Amino acid sequence: VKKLINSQISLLIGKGLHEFDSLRDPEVNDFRTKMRQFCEEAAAHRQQLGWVEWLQYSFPLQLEPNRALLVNVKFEGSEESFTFQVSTKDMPLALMACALRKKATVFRQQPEEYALQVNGRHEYLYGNYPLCHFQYICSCLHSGLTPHLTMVHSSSILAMRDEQSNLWSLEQPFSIELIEGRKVNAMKLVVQAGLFHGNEMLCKTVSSSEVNVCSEPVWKQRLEFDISVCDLPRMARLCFALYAVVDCPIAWANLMLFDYKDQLKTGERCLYMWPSVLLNPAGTVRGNPNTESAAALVIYLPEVAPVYFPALEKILELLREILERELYEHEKDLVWKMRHEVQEHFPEALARLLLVTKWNKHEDVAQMLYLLCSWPELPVLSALELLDFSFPDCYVGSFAIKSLRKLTDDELFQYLLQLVQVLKYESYLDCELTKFLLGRALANRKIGHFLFWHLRSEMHVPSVALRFGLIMEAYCRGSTHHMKVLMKQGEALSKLKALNDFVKVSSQKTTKPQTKEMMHMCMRQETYMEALSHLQSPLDPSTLLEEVCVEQCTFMDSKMKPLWIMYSSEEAGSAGNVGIIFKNGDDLRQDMLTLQMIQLMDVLWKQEGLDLRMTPYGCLPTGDRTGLIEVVLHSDTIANIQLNKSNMAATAAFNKDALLNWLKSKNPGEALDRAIEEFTLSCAGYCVATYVLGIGDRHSDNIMIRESGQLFHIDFGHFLGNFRVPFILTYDFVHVIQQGKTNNSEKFERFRGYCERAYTILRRHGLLFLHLFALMRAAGLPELSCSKDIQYLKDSLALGKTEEEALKHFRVKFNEALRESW
Template identity: 35%
Template sequence: MVHIPSPYAFDFWFQESTEPNVELSCLMPNGMFIPLPANRNAILLEIKEELWEEASKYPLHGILQDASSYIFSCVSTMGETEELRDENRRLCDIKPFCSVLKLIERRKRDVDGDERALNFQISSLIGKGLHEFEGLKNPEVNDFRWKMKLLGTEVARIRQNKTWLEKVAYQYPPRIASSDKIPPSCKARMRESSYFVDSTSITTYDYYIDSRFQNTETAFKFNVSCTTTPKELLHLIMNKKSITLNSRGEDPNDFLLKVCGQEEYLIGDYPLVRFLYIQECLSRDITPIVVVVSVNSVSVDQDYVYETLDDIDINRTRHSLLSLTLRKNKGKYQSSWTIDDLFSFKVCAISRLNTDVNRTVEVGIQAGLFHGGKPLCESQKTVEKLVSKEGSVEFEQELQFDIQVANIPRMARLCFAIYEMSKTAKGVKARKLKDSKQDLYMNPVAWVNTTVYDFKNQLKTGDMTLYMWTYAEDSQNEDMLQSLGTVVSNTNVDHATALTVSFKRYSSEYTIMYPTVEKMIEYAKDHFDPSTVTTRSDTEIRNYLDTVMQMAESDPLHDMHEQEMKELWAMRYESQMYAPSLLPKILDSVEWNSHKDVAEAISLLQKWPKLPVEKALELLDYAYADQQVRSFAVKCLQSVSDEALSLYLLQLVQALKHESYLSCDLVEFLLRRALSNRKIGHYLFWHLKSEMTVPCVSVRFGLILEAYCRGSQQHLDILSKQLDYLNKMKETSELIRQRKDRDKAKQWLHERLSEAHFCSDAF
């Protein structure tokens, strides 16, 4: 039992007590008073984590910023107000008067003006004010912004410690072939020669390369070997220059090789022939031209850590996982796999429904559980009710699904659709009502999706308002429930149809959480069923797997029958050894509405060999919704070269749309690579920016863009110029369209482009 002395004595903290816990009185920035039991030896960081969990159960939680935006203050034993900036201090050492702690906002540093300017520049670039993110009052958004700020600062510090040459490679990434083999198209343009080493014939290939000097007429031509590196060529050039021009004392290390006419440098300890510029020239039978430039003439941004975070702030994230573990050990959490109740929730009401007020309208709500686009059980419907003149309907009806809470997978989504009862069908999604004496149709009106678990792995409980989307007229999806649609509510909260639901609380004492990976692996080990493994001979297994592999390669879109899936699932261990590329087919065979199968699949995934990039990309499709599956796919992409990653970048950005939560391995992977290679960062920025006008992804993509901009602030000026030029071209295009005379429009365009300020500002 928590010791609550009444009244608090002035020497309370100095009295000996056998009770390890005290009750803190916490004063929140949103005006709430929260009593919080805490261990006397707990550090402030742990207390803040516990307090934030508790605050989520109180009103006005949404207006709180991320926990890192606040620090504790208290009245000290000296009777003075003390700001507790060191969050590693223990409660028993602080001894707050009357056990009262107050949360206050961190004081801004002297860089407020710079921060405002930076925020304005980022807002202009992404086309969305950063205050809009804060206005969402969404804990997941706040948590994601904080994590990404930490990630950007971490990468910036790594960049800060790089050598000058490594910084050049970041800012001007060299284009290098992924393979060290010379392409046949290049070999055909090279001279073949042979020499002997210890009676062994060695074949090599030579080619010519032109070298020039910056701002001079001096030029040399060299016949170089296929093994010659940029550093070796620089030595050859400088030696020839010193002999030809009688110049001495120039160090080759003070120069770099630059591609003629491009901001591209040949740097790194690679053979010259591995650089794509050299390969492109040779394949077109063109002599490559390189320019020798001084290192002092290479413009390299001065790197610095953009935001000096206190060490305690950085330690916060490292400690948060430990703190979370400590909280779990206290017994406040219960695994969802222990809940055998059928999943149910209450549909409360809808409001602001856009219907014709001059006629009687009856609407109902259909709901379904999906995972990877496939239903987990039969969908459910409410009774149909009349819509009031204000566009609202009160349902107060509970919907129960034929699936236990234990069997709902982590990434399951709950899909809603409002439909109108009508005698005529409207659109391809209309459904004729069965078992009806008259012809009635269900015409869909609005839809919305949400996840069953929140971003902290907790089963959602309590009331929730979802803002719905209207159906697109040109949509090719004929299903009423949009299982592949976004899980983000409509951002136009003032005008969108609002659906209020209430999720059931399955335990009055515990928070229901989805099991961790470790718990799932342990469960799979303890509940292994030998009957689910094949008894076929090794030869039969190999023959069957060969057949499946041939089928998968010839027709990747082939849907397996249920019996085929069962047979392949029974051979999952053999597939892991002999045919790891069949992993997508194995995952297709998993019964995701059975937590036993899910545990077995996740356990199997931990030992699965890494897949080629193409197969890994397949696992990022919407059909593979599981968090661990998508994390495995990202691990397979970690070793891909920057040049190869550029080829798949657009597809990876599109795969972000299939993620159910803001924070995921794919986002972190893309941001780390973008912040380590400006070329990738450039393309990532514009891939995301191009879809910022799409409402359902504007928040997700906007947050990723903000994270990139904060982590690569030297890139912002260049991006701003590009955006400015793009806007000018857009404006010019609109003005040209208004001119009917083609010749006059062409003349006006030439005049417009010849204006000095039109192009100079952009370059």
């Protein structure tokens, strides 16, 4: 029984559970035990929940950040439905009450017992909220489509829950014996060694003696550091760098001076080094698992006796305003002097105080930790800044989580990608961040779905494969049913990869209609038909990919031959006519990050009352250079619309009219007025979005138009001006904005106003963009690798200037794009 679950986890995570045992590591074994129990206890509480509370887990509410409408309602065991005339201000309970009264007149004879399931979707309508606050109703309100809902009784929901169950004394300096190496290179070898506490040094780096390349080099040298053993912070990091000199970097390796049990490491240690692109403190504290080819560094941690880092009770036992808006030595001394006044009057300034404290002097740390243990809870924004590698202390790490508990399931979902990357900065497997991540994942099925995929997509990277595999296993222990649900998704993606491999080969050997017909024949096979059907969309668990519409499936002509997979659902009808894009060969992490950042911009705008009709379509990396994209139906690229093909309704005399004529054929008469507003709003939003994010390499092939008039951008191959990029304005768009007139200044000044507003709103939450992009440096992304990358945002947002100076600077950049526009 349990054996099947193990073999299931192994296949799902893509790593055998025997691999964890084979290492014979007690840190791993202790993580597996402690977290399993934690996740099994998390699974237990879930079984003793209420039916509404279970709906809050399985299907969390999709809400938005008067006027009547038609709504179709049916009951679970019947085809017969009723169409009502409800208001957008109505609660689902009133709609549920109408459905029960209309059932009673048909059947010839309480709303609080039911829930409204969205037809052919893992979405529900409940809670004291008006219908126009629900994301599904709003999708139906703007498109004009009729919403279809199903009355699901408390007993049927409770049936689902049931079928889905399971010390200061050591004053000598820190020193090490650098014994020998086992590397490969072309010259002499030097071992540079430093002691770090996050981004900064505890003492100055000490180098080794130049020993000839004759690999398998021997030093047997005693390296001393200008720091006392008693001064070593709990999270102290000993970092090594091996390089060739007559500079050529060869490899790097880091290790924690204390273990997971808080004991100071002593003795002989073999360090399997990682290849180099000089000293890398941010890099992993675990060795290269490629012991076969990886270079090794033999070092000795000298004994000082068993010494454990002191417990919290022992640690606890032992012109100010003008600068508080990078600081000189005298200024640092000021903040440390008036450290008590910071706790009392500037709690949010905790970050600046944590950076001025001398972590290389243990008495200074104890005083800081004493202030931290009695420090007031920080706002979510400040707690996000504290998760950065700049704050490596465990007690600091704990404080950040403590302040992040007030995060809503909506807020946490938005920053989940960033919180997952931060796991790479973690020094030990058992951490307060994982316990928080798992805890929230097991209390919300949507959080858990995306936690899984964010971890599973990185299993091909050896440095994080152990950590992630272990996290994903603990999650599976807490959710046996979800593990199976996730397995179905993996089976589909497995088949998609093989089908794509065929398409890739065939496209080089025959014509497109021939390859297309054989993709279809391959899809129609029993194993393919069964695997590609009846699964929760990995891009959105609430979207159900039911029957695969094989005839409507195809592939794309770009280098990587991306797959176009279409679906259909009877129950959902038109909300079940969903499409996905499978791409293999390109890394989709940046694309996801860019779409998430655009998705947040849209949230920050919608909170301020402004809806710039953005298209935040899904993008999810799933494996090694593998991922998915959400199809935006009834949309086409600018280029395809501009190709002005014959026999069509969009016959344009001039190129500038290509877009407007297309919108005319898709929006007739009084429908076009709406489409032009949709275009103007979305154009304004994407103009500011692309400018702030610094998206380059823009052409008619990567800009798309919805049939509703809504403009959007695809394929974000380059961001932060990494190819300083300017604002972009195209004559064909200005023409649409101006309703198809050479001079329509009033429609353009309104457009210029949408840009300024969007720009001012983003600037107010500028720090939110800085803190998130700073945590994203942990991903490895080459275009977001250093501080110079972060600098583009500081400039594009102008966060060191006043609103009047920044709005003027924006007008200058807007005028430079208008002049460049032909």
